[PDB]
Design a protein around this ligand. Structure first.
Ligand code: PXG
Ligand code: PXG
Ligand code: NA
Lengths: 320, 320
């Protein structure tokens, strides 16, 4: 729509949500068949999701009461489960119905929605017959989380190329399997803090860019968009960027992206479900190009948010 | 020490434990200052130890009523906490007393003891360092767990050098920080199963051996012991192996160990807190040397178990 419009709508819905007396206005979780407040939600200590981070997950947004690309996210987590040798425990029809019920019960119009699938009590129940405790699922709905707050998207944020950490390589863990084994990404966040920046861009250690702590990385040079094609999550936001680029006849290249290229970029942005299209205007303490949010970034930002109202990519939740 | 002495004592103590009606005879945990049955124990869904596996841990054994090298393990977890910017949340003297008291209450004489320290309820992303020191602790005591059961230790087990996975590199996560981000190790276990073996030995992808799924790797060739010096946990069992080798004037080399050397070894064993000294007599489906448990492995095994009764390395729990 326009930075102003998208954000003003959000802030108006937030004012209403903050005045709600519904206890679920702060969020709602599904654990062991029960709906509970997130602060009250408790998972088994012996769950392998905790004991060995033996899990996959996914995160979907609701924006202005409309789920965005829920089907794409659920297909991705099904693929993640297959790669992990996990069985996704709920039929997709029913997980969609339960999530929509949870969102409706909360009254939250702008939501962060997390789905976690773990290997359950497989470790402690080895001797036991195969049953429902071999794969566990947890669902969480919270007010929308911003990796870059709206006010900061206006002028862009500050990134570093990490030098104390590199991305877990695919031979150690396939990064197309969304996962919570964030040891590298967490370290990256601390390195950024130490260096006076916010957003860590991790390399593969072999001179190319990968991704960061909750986002994919996109470079813009001479009217062409570039984003890494290996070593990263195949982001649904990135998928949407590709859709917008193609609709605008902007060439977009999924390929290996050398670290060097970031230092000459015309524009840089990050992309994620938790915040959308997030400009980067400082890199390693120096301006990206002129230090301004660039025109291609703005076109992608606008097209991205317009997609949230397109019925091919979204549907409205029934708040009753 | 003596294979049949050590194991016969264990089986006798087990028979007695299995007769008990003490509620905690199957284990006991300590969660939010409260004691809890392991199957009842719960952690907050929002704990960052779950949400981003943002934690370190350690595992200690009790053998025949005696804690083994508890001080070394607690020193290691303090070091791990320092490296992760976690503040270990209880005095070390309190944790030692609580763990001994848990063991006493359970009546378990041969125990697996786990200590987990997580980031807590506030995640690193978007936070200031000063808001990240309210860190959580979880303690767990279970009947002793065997990475290799006693009957199998008599003849040795079956390993593979993994080809579908390699160890998370130190640049992605420091392997001297004991952690539960087991994506590689878990995959290794599946690879071993697929290939008809049990124990995965992960390389660093750069042609050297690292460690496996809960153990360090030790090779023996021409009377000399070899074990990797980087890319791995500095195991307390490995430290005990070095103590026993020195006491026996057996040369031990901590150095880079090429994958190739495993194929020519006179003997191979794994070492871990959960089972001790565990011979490997088949590698990639072929015998290790003559396929028998070797004489140096046996000398290490004997000395290891002897250390469990040495007051320099152990102390008795007071069961009342
Ligand atoms: C490593 C990584 N890479 C890329 C993305 C972007 O993927 P999507 O475009 O499909 O969302 C992510 C997204 N991961 C994610 C999404 C939303 C919130 C948070 C959080 O840490 O608060 C993390 C991620 O964690
Ligand atoms: C990766 C790794 N490397 C080496 C060791 C051996 O370290 P110690 O000699 O200090 O124990 C470990 C040990 N880790 C460990 C120990 C006991 C049980 C389990 C389990 O998850 O069942 C894991 C480990 O997990
Ligand atoms: Na389940």
């Amino acid at each position: 729509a326009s930075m102003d419009k998208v954000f003003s709508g959000y802030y108006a819905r937030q004012k209403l949500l903050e005045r709600s007396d519904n206890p679920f206005s702060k969020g709602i979780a599904y654990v062991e068949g029960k709906l509970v407040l997130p602060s009250d939600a408790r998972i088994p200590l012996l769950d392998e999701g905790f004991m060995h981070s033996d899990l996959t997950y996914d995160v979907i947004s609701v924006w202005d009461g409309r789920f965005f690309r829920l089907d794409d996210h659920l297909q991705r987590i099904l693929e993640s489960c297959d790669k992990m040798r996990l069985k996704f425990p709920l039929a997709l029809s029913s997980v969609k119905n339960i999530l929509a019920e949870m969102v409706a019960k909360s009254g939250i119009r702008d939501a962060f929605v997390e789905v976690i699938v773990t290997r359950g009590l497989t470790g402690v129940r080895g001797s036991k017959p195969e049953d429902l405790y071999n794969n566990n699922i947890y669902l969480l709905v919270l007010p929308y989380i911003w990796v870059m707050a709206p006010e900061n998207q206006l002028h862009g944020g500050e990134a570093i190329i990490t030098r104390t950490v590199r991305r877990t390589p695919p031979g150690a863990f396939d990064p197309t399997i969304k996962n919570l084994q964030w040891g590298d990404l967490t370290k990256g966040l601390f390195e950024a803090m130490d260096r006076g920046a916010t957003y860590p861009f991790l390399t593969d250690g072999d001179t190319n860019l990968t991704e960061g702590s909750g986002f994919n990385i996109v470079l813009v040079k001479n009217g062409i968009i570039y984003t890494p094609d290996r070593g990263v999550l195949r982001g649904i936001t990135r998928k949407s960027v590709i859709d917008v680029a193609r609709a605008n006849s902007i060439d977009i290249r999924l390929e290996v992206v050398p670290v060097e290229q970031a230092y000459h970029s015309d524009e840089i942005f990050m992309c994620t479900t938790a915040g959308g299209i997030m400009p980067i205007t400082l890199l390693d303490g120096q301006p990206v190009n002129d230090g301004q949010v660039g025109p291609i970034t703005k076109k992608i930002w606008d097209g991205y948010w317009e997609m949230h109202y397109n019925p091919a990519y979204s549907f409205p939740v029934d708040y009753g």
